[PDB]
């Protein structure tokens, strides 16, 4: 069961040419997030590949928030706290995906990202659970990518499986 305040690293698995790997989400200018490479399974920098579930609300509840200013379930809406930086996962209005960084304020939809399966609903969510997930203020996915010679994040129209491991 993964918990608000938990540490975790978001990984996800990349295959090209016949050759696996695991990456897992990065930060750190222009606030953007991107990937690194694994292997048991760790990456160069740990530092800033760590992540703080720092809240988990249903939309409901984030909806009344909004328009007024812990076990996981799968349809909730969490908080991504980058622990190096102090920021927030968000998505990016700038380029047909949008790019992924880090913001300060936990103000506004941006920062919101509900979580779905890859059931299920109001169910609990699993580690060994493969999660998908969308961004409430664009209703995109966090999306491996894939550019000329290396892996990409961003937040585009397809789903890609994640695996949030306490740690």
Known sequence: FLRTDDEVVLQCTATIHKEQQKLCLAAEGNRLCFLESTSKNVPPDLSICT???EQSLSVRALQEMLANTRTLLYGHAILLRHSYSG???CCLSTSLAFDVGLQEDTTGEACWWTIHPARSEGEKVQVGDDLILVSVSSERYLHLSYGNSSWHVDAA???TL???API
Do not use: E
Request: hydrophobic share 65%.
């Open 51 to 53: 992540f703080v579930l």
């Open 87 to 89: 920021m927030y996962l």
């Open 157 to 159: 129209f397809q789903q």
């Open 162 to 164: 994640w695996s949030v």
